[PDB]
Design a binder for this molecule. Structure first.
Ligand SMILES: O=C(NCCCNc1nc(Nc2cccc(CN3CCOCC3)c2)ncc1C1CC1)C1CCC1
Ligand SMILES: O=C(NCCCNc1nc(Nc2cccc(CN3CCOCC3)c2)ncc1C1CC1)C1CCC1
Lengths: 619, 619
């Protein structure tokens, strides 16, 4: 294949990375080093209006802006080319096309996108530039030297991302907020895998319905979807259930989207507010909490300099457990946080190693709430464009099922761990009061006798009668403690055994079994992606394509069956069993507490007769 | 490209999987389904001597034997082809060629290899078959439905793997043990990434030196390496330091290899013993233990039905901490194992969540012992065969550095966790004795007074003088406890802070930084693998190959520098700091114990004068 060139670079025309009305982008090399670069070639002012604007871009130095290195002349034409930083990974679009991102980015990746888009935007503004159309295709991805994605803006200076005024397309007036809109759509797309505003069929098919959805949108709504043809619009101010972002993050993100997806730019946020509100999210650290009675994991987004008081409030918001009722467990022991303890001084947590919260007050066992998504039907009609689109969708469904399977397993593993720890904690309490009791018996049983000690050496009868009631009261405690110990023992009604008998375990390798099926589906999907780009298949490759179409469905059905019949069913049995075990536990702790307070009441009444034994003497 | 065929199958001649003197193996498809199969075509008794042997193989049904499905006639020739199970992953050879396996398989994979080879071998024997030459190329890998490798034997009925009698090449006499030899070599290769018997240069280059090494091999040795030309042989009965297998596994594997790599078949093990000894390994479960004072992780290979007594003995073997001195910690709390408790009833562990062992007796802080491996020099001479070989080696070195970096980080993370837990445990002890003390003060300070109580109501002077010494003795305890509490406090000499200040942390992302560099090296390695197979490169591809040769070295140097300067240096500082913190801790626990025993001594002497207060009375 032929290639163009300049003094320092050359590039195959086959290795094209991007195509715009203004220019083409190819992947090329430095002739002398061999290093990869993106070559931007313009097809066609006044002459120096661009040479100037080329210069300003060369000056821009920021982590979140794709770098413009040099401006050279192509060899065959004297036309200007731009040598720009090559981004091997591609764009946010590339990422969002992965079947595993069909329902939104993983939370960690979403946060990098949020951070980098925001930092890039701000840098432009800081230099006076406006990037009229941000979109996943504009947002380039590179692997940072620490293995983390870095997102970088390029091509500054589409329908689904255009503002309602921009979607109409008068010069966009003249002076921005319009940029916040495509940012809003972009962030929603990244969070959910879908566009927020969706006419039935496609936006392009119904340009008019799309405009109606966006202008007639009620304030606060962040999405509007038409599910049937010519049907009404389902509005929402919330993220879809299928979104993977934590409730903690959803609660912060939602208001931002709502306030930058606002039609009347009168009430749009403006950049500075947007920058403040997004930075406030980005600057928060995350503390992982697991609600043991609700069977729910939580991410608490809290500032380094925030107190435990604020932490408790944030936990109440997600659990509805008031601060005073929040009992914390971490790495096998109670965690007691002083009110003014800064979050940066909290113990380190992960999703696998969270702080557990428990309450002495009854709570509904919730578990994981997720979307029930079935396989789309597979259209038997051979079609390279349709099949690749379908392959993506059905693989996307199985990926989601796999992510849920993983979360379900995690929830069960955390449950088992928290329960194990809580039982040991309760046992400490049982042992703490049992010492306290035996400790007061030793003085009570001693002082009850010390009275008669003097008699052998007229009212005392009134002292013995009230006291012998205490020993009798202590007999009632003994038998009740023996009953609690009995329940905490291996055969006890608060036994652990069921937790190892119910649900699913790592050794079951359910996640891995599903991943294997997913991997088969993903290979076929990518091949279909190849088959689409190649317009026609030869007879053999055609049949093989049709065979694997059936194989896709076969793999998907097998996965879903395993997921529902094995993963979900056993999870729901474990959950139902947990719910009863929780109920018993609360009842036991409540009875134990009562026995403990009785031990304190008895102890102090005995600490009163200890002195009343000795009278004043004549001397 | 042309393809051969049969009624049911067809295959490109380009898609060849394997080549033997007897037959070729291609990757083909069922014509009607499209399903992949291995087609084995024979090039050439008597006629039915093979039709019979083909039939016996068709009957063989085992997980660890590659399946023979059918025997069909090719279309152009009436020649017999075998349709066999296609193994998408390839062979153990394929696996061992990966740069990340240059120093042996990961322990988990090695165990699957051990299991599957053994199960396959046994199945053959159970049917009377002998597989004269097992080798990594004979051992096929498939992904099991649970995502785990399954290894399968094929091609039954090389130099480095041949027995000394076989290496000579008289009909191999007639009747096996000879098979155990290539099994021995294979397992050693899998464990270490290298052949056990290595003349200088290559075995093929020095067929004579190789035979000398193997026959003149002293008993017990499992390897023999000639490091210089015409130089002596370094024998070893142990695994190389660079081996990744745990000491626990190494201790069991080594004797097996030594006894099946035995020259004189007089003293070779024989199959049944081999099957017993290997099964005994495969049937053991693993308990992860971390020695906190030695800074060493351990895998304890123990039977389900073994007792804690046996467990302690196994731990002593790897740590040299006698049973009685072994103090166990798990998930933040002491673990007390009853002597007869079966290992299957132990708490579940992983490398990340081990049982910690500590001792009140001094131990040398060891840390991780690993091989210091430097980069090979890169030969500037362009050579497709040499460069691909070199690329593999240098990438192999960086992978090893990456695995070590990971283990070093883990060791530090475990240290930090164990220390954190131990400090809380010591604090419990401090609080347990402090209650005990105040508890006896309340009776001592009471009974010291109860004496004078009677006087106000001739020898007592002898009672007060011994007793006032006890209160004085209790004053000496109080001040000593206040000194221990002081050390356990945030400013205390047993502070935790250094552990968060020294070494490296997950947030440093050192492992990930190295992985990125490794990924760049691995892409180039695979391209070189492609460049080798293609005999010559065009001018451009040639230069690019030479450029990336320099890039390989650049990436490797950067990685090693980061590893030594950042990972290793900070690890060694953390280790040195740990060593002193351990020393203090032992001293503190020793002083605390002493204060605790004094609290018991005082307590019982006071529990004697409690009754001696009251005399017999006339009545
Ligand atoms: O830049 C634009 N649009 C989208 C981005 C095309 N640009 C790039 N793509 C890339 N990389 C890239 C683009 C698309 C796909 C991929 C992934 N491919 C996988 C297969 O092997 C080739 C890379 C990589 N790097 C840099 C750039 C230019 C300098 C900013 C403007 C619209 C036409 C110009
Ligand atoms: O079987 C023999 N030698 C080595 C194994 C060749 N056989 C196979 N290879 C495979 N798979 C395989 C072999 C080599 C490489 C690979 C990996 N390739 C990666 C690139 O895409 C094609 C597969 C896969 N499957 C089955 C078989 C035969 C039925 C037992 C005997 C020696 C010649 C016959």
């Amino acid at each position: 294949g032929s290639m163009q060139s300049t003094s320092n670079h050359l590039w195959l025309l086959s290795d094209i990375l991007g195509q715009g009305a203004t220019a083409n982008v190819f992947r090329g090399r430095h002739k002398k080093t061999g290093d990869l670069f993106a070559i931007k070639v313009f097809n066609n002012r006044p002459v120096d209006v661009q040479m100037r604007e080329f210069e300003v871009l060369k000056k821009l130095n920021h982590k979140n802006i794709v770098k413009l290195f040099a401006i050279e002349e192509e060899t065959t034409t004297r036309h200007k080319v731009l040598i720009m930083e090559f981004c091997p990974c591609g764009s946010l679009y590339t990422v969002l096309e992965e079947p595993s991102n069909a329902y939104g980015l993983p939370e960690s990746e979403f946060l990098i996108v949020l951070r980098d888009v925001v930092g890039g935007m701000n840098h432009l503004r800081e230099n006076g530039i406006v990037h009229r159309n941000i979109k996943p295709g504009n947002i380039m991805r590179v692997i940072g030297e620490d293995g983390q994605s870095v997102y970088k803006l390029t091509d500054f200076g589409t329908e689904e991302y255009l503002h309602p005024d921009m979607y109409e397309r008068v010069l966009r007036k003249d002076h921005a907020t319009v940029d916040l809109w495509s940012i809003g759509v972009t962030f929603y797309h990244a969070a959910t895998g879908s566009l927020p505003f969706r006419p039935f069929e496609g936006p392009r098919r119904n340009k008019e319905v799309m405009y109606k959805i966006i202008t007639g949108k009620p304030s606060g709504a962040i999405s509007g979807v038409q599910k049937a043809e010519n049907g009404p619009i389902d509005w929402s101010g919330d993220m879809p259930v299928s979104c993977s972002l934590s409730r903690g993050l959803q609660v912060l993100l939602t208001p931002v989207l709502a306030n930058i997806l606002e039609a009347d730019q009168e009430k749009c946020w403006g950049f500075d507010q947007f920058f403040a509100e997004t930075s406030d999210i980005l600057h928060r650290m995350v503390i992982h909490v697991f609600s043991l009675q609700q069977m729910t994991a939580h991410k608490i987004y809290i500032h380094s300099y925030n107190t435990a008081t604020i932490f408790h409030e944030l936990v109440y918001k997600q659990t509805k457990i008031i601060s005073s009722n929040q009992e914390l467990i971490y790495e096998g022991r109670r965690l007691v946080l002083e009110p003014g303890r800064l979050a940066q001084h909290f113990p380190k947590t992960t999703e696998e190693n969270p702080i557990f919260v428990v309450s002495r007050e009854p709570l509904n066992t919730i578990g994981l709430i997720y979307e029930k998504i079935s396989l789309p039907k597979v259209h038997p009609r051979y079609d390279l464009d349709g099949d690749a689109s379908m392959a993506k969708a059905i693989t996307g469904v199985v990926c989601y099922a796999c992510r849920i399977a993983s979360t379900l397993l995690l929830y069960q593993e955390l449950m088992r761990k928290g329960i194990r720890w809580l039982i040991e904690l309760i046992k400490d309490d049982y042992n703490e009061t049992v010492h306290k009791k035996t400790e007061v018996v030793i003085t009570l049983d001693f002082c009850i006798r010390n009275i008669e000690k003097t008699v052998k050496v007229m009212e005392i009868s009134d002292i013995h009668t009230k006291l012998l009631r205490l020993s009798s009261s202590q007999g009632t405690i003994e038998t009740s403690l023996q009953d609690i110990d009995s329940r905490l023992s291996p055969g006890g009604s608060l036994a652990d055994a069921w937790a190892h008998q119910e649900g699913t375990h790592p050794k079951d390798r359910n996640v891995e079994k599903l991943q294997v099926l997913l991997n088969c589906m993903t290979e076929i999907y990518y091949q279909f992606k190849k088959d689409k780009a190649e317009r026609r298949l030869a007879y053999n490759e055609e049949q093989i394509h049709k065979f694997d179409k059936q194989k896709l469905y076969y793999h998907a059905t097998k996965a879903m069956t395993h997921f529902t019949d094995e993963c979900v069913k056993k999870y729901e049995a474990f959950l139902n069993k947990s719910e009863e075990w929780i109920r018993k536990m609360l009842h036991l702790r409540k009875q134990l507490l009562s026995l403990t307070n009785q031990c304190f009441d008895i102890e102090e009444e005995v600490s009163k007769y200890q002195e009343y034994t000795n009278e004043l003497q004549e001397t």
